[PDB]
Amino acid sequence: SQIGLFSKICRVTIKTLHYYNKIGLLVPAYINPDNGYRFYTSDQLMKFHQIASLRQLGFTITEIVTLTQDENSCHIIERRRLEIQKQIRDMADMLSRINHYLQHKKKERIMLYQAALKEIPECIVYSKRFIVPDFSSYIKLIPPIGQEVMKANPGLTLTTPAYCFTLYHDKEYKEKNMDVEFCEAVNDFGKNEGNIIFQVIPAITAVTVIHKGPYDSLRNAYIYLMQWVEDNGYLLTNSPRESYIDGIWNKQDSAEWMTEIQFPVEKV
Amino acid sequence: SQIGLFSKICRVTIKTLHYYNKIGLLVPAYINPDNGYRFYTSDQLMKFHQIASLRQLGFTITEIVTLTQDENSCHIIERRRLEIQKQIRDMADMLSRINHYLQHKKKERIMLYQAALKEIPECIVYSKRFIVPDFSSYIKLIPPIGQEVMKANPGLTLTTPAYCFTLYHDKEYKEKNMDVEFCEAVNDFGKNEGNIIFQVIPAITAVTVIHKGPYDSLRNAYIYLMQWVEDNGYLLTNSPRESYIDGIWNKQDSAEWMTEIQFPVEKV
DNA sequence: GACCCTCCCCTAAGGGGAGGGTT
DNA sequence: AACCCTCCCCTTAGGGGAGGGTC
Ligand code: 118
Ligand code: 118
């Protein structure tokens, strides 16, 4: 049978048959010497049925080749059964997250915060832990904490880029007192003194948002992420971080400052 | 800041930023015309965060370009929400079919029958329906049906390719006293004569298996598919068909005959 | 040493078209 | 008018490298 009739027996295109001949998957029975026409037989249909049966399960062309021509090779099959099992979960994750998105967007018709999952490697910081009655006092007391360590240490060179942040060790926030820690990232180790010390901070996988404006609205960010971990089936595994990007040290207008809120989470 | 530092702030590659600047997404702040360098500001971070957040939900590049500037248009979100569910339903079916494949090949070292789904369009047929005591009497009594209609209907042309099959209208699989109909597909209508009738068979979606060899073991095929429909959560909708591809009219070696069993099914 | 630019070819499974040949 | 063949570029979201200029 010619290529045009065999293409209607199998309900497949002609370019597909040309491609399969080029790859080496389905070779015709007889090829005309001067014209170059292709003629097919019934066993070609017997093989095309097997090809389509394998292709309907998601295998790629190379695995289909290795499955038809070679020995049974069961180890290829189970490797696909994992690749599906993982993939479903990913889809089942995204269908959740988009359902959050609409559920907020159609509520307000404007989006102030957008969350994103990312990875933060491990670092080496100098740090100071203490209790604070009011956040403004914490802002006021940190620059001398920087001055002491920068003067009293040889070769204290910051990182590129700059990573400076605050750790909240409290379980449920309250404005009265706050067990806080100040951390700034450096390159090497050294000598310790006073109430400030060097320590390593391990890597995390965190959901982050970015807040723009003054600090007096920062709580509005947290209420968002406390929702995002509750809807999409995640679990808060560690202390949050508050990293500082743009402030009084680079700018003059407080309505153009910029900070970042980070929640380390796991999938539960 | 130069591009090599900004790529460290964003935790992406440089080729990504080049590609984005080319396609018109996140164009840099200030390009110097003498050397051609790209300088980024802290204003670009709050847009890259949004790009990555939209990208983590599965959207494509053109969708992200259309979203960040036409923000009133929100039906793309539903357009993606439906496709997510469709993909989930497809993967959950591929998983069960892979499981059936491994379960079948587990105990039996090799497998003969490989099922595959396909579409069959509507057709015009001439047919004749009756009761037979056995299958052999059926095979012997067929050819008069083919001779008579050609005698009484001059100029009646078959289709290309040929489609010649039989329908088993009985509810339970049997071996004797079978209620069977014989159908052959033609191009144009005609007139009825006796029990021979003309009708139209509708279009179906079916799972198919190809049997090769003598007729007597064909029952095995009817077993295998009957397992499949039960194993993978399908429902049989209509009578099975038996379609003839290679037989005694083309060959003498009965070990080269080819036939196809087709079960019309539905995902229930 | 360390950084940066433009330009060309590559990915999987075919799709679409231009141009030439025979009955 | 109908079939058939071969050659060339096209699709995603960026990767890899060569050659050459700039801090
Ligand atoms: C030690 C302690 C605080 C600061 Sb900074 C800062 C530095 C680099 C990158 C981001 C922030 C600061 C303040 C005034 C003038 C110059 C630098 C700082 C201040 C308040 C809150 C968080 C950080 C610096 C060293
Ligand atoms: C009407 C009735 C039977 C056949 Sb055939 C057949 C021929 C070509 C392609 C497919 C089928 C037949 C057999 C012997 C001699 C002449 C014609 C046929 C017979 C029994 C079972 C299945 C098909 C054709 C028309």
Author numbering:
A (entry chain G), B (entry chain H): 2 to 269
Sentences from the paper on this structure:
Bacterial RNA polymerase (RNAP) holoenzyme initiates transcription by recognizing the conserved –35 and –10 promoter elements that are optimally separated by a 17-bp spacer. The MerR family of transcriptional regulators activate suboptimal 19–20 bp spacer promoters in response to myriad cellular signals, ranging from heavy metals to drug-like compounds. Here we report one crystal structure of a multidrug-sensing MerR family regulator EcmrR and nine cryo-electron microscopy structures that capture the EcmrR-dependent transcription process from promoter opening to initial transcription to RNA elongation. These structures reveal that EcmrR is a dual ligand-binding factor that reshapes the suboptimal 19-bp spacer DNA to enable optimal promoter recognition, sustains promoter remodeling to stabilize initial transcribing complexes, and finally dissociates from the promoter to reverse DNA remodeling and facilitate the transition to elongation.
When including ribonucleoside triphosphates (rNTPs) in the complexes (see METHOD DETAILS), we obtained two structures of the RNAP-promoter initial transcribing complexes (RPitc) containing either a 3-nt de novo synthesized RNA transcript on the heteroduplex DNA scaffold (hereinafter designated EcmrR-RPitc-3nt) or a 4-nt RNA transcript on a fully complementary DNA scaffold (hereinafter designated EcmrR-RPitc-4nt). In comparison, site II is relatively flexible and undergoes significant conformational changes between its un-liganded, CTA+-bound and CHAPSO-bound forms. Y174 and R220, which partially occupy site II in the absence of ligand, gradually lift up as a ligand binds and as the bound ligand gets bulkier.
